[PDB]
């Protein structure tokens, strides 16, 4: 069996010194009825 | 640099009271775990033939004549020095120098006057300042 414990993300990018990139992620649905 | 570096005089065989000169740019080396200190540069080199010995005509006061004087002529700076020029010289019986046309040098060299204004670096323009640089 497998269940998700946690997640994180990483972006190969360049960013301005004090640029706060703004984006968001969301889950639509998941298998196994969690 | 001991004898009078002027050309309008035959050098003396002896040096005179100058001694060898100083320099603006003395270096030192430690390539052996011990000092070397390097204070001197040439200015002239002189060729002498013991004339009355060679003639075998006299034995008292064998002053060789100067056949010719090499001139070794330098550019100077507080960190480096190098030849500007060299000449063959020899001396007439009236004591006039006679000289060959020199051989002359120049070297690409450091400067503080000409420096360019600064330029942007698009290629890298943000990718430094703590983590974003690695090289």
Swiss-Prot record, chain A:
Q: Which protein, by its recorded name, is this?
A: Toxin subunit YenA2
In its record, the post-translational modification comment is: The isolated toxin complex includes 3 peptides starting between residues 768 and 778 of this protein, which might be physiologically relevant.
- According to its UniProt entry, this protein's organism is Yersinia entomophaga
Q: Which residues of the full protein are shown?
A: 1219 to 1252 of 1364
Question: What this chain does, per the record?
Answer: Part of an orally active toxin complex (TC) with strong insecticidal effects on larvae of the Coleoptera Costelytra zealandica, Acrossidius tasmania and Adoryphorus couloni and some Lepidoptera larvae. The TC has an endochitinase activity.
Where's it found, cell-wise? Secreted
Annotated knockout phenotype: Cells with a disrupted yenA1-yenA2-chi2-yenB-yenC1-yenC2 locus are no longer pathogenic in C.zealandica larvae.
**Subunit note:** Semipurified toxin complex consists of at least YenA1-YenA2-YenB-YenC1-YenC2-Chi1-Chi2. The Yen-TC:K9 subcomplex is about 26 nm tall and 22 nm in diameter with 5-fold symmetry and 5 copies of YenA1, YenA2, Chi1 and Chi2; the chitinase subunits may be solvent accessible on the exterior the complex. The Yen-TC:K9 subcomplex has no insecticidal activity. The native complex with additional YenB, YenC1 and YenC2 subunits is 16 nm taller and is insecticidal; the toxicity-conferring subunits are present at about 1 copy each.
UniProtKB/Swiss-Prot annotation, chain B:
Kindly list any coiled-coil regions of this protein: none
User: What stretches pass through the bilayer?
Assistant: none
State what the entry records as the consequence of deleting this gene: Cells with a disrupted yenA1-yenA2-chi2-yenB-yenC1-yenC2 locus are no longer pathogenic in C.zealandica larvae.
Sequence similarity: In the N-terminal section; belongs to the SpvB family.
What is known about its subunit structure? Semipurified toxin complex consists of at least YenA1-YenA2-YenB-YenC1-YenC2-Chi1-Chi2. YenB and the N-terminus of YenC2 form a large hollow shell of beta-strands. The shell is closed at both ends, within which the C-terminus of YenC2 is probably found. The Yen-TC:K9 subcomplex is about 26 nm tall and 22 nm in diameter with 5-fold symmetry and 5 copies of YenA1, YenA2, Chi1 and Chi2; the chitinase subunits may be solvent accessible on the exterior the complex. The Yen-TC:K9 subcomplex has no insecticidal activity.
- In UniProt terms, what function does this protein have? Part of an orally active toxin complex (TC) with strong insecticidal effects on larvae of the Coleoptera Costelytra zealandica, Acrossidius tasmania and Adoryphorus couloni and some Lepidoptera larvae. The TC has an endochitinase activity.
Q: What is this protein called?
A: Toxin subunit YenB
Q: What is the lineage of its organism?
A: Bacteria, Pseudomonadati, Pseudomonadota, Gammaproteobacteria, Enterobacterales
Gene that this polypeptide is encoded by:
yenB
From which residue to which, out of the full length, is covered?
Answer: 272 to 406 of 1487
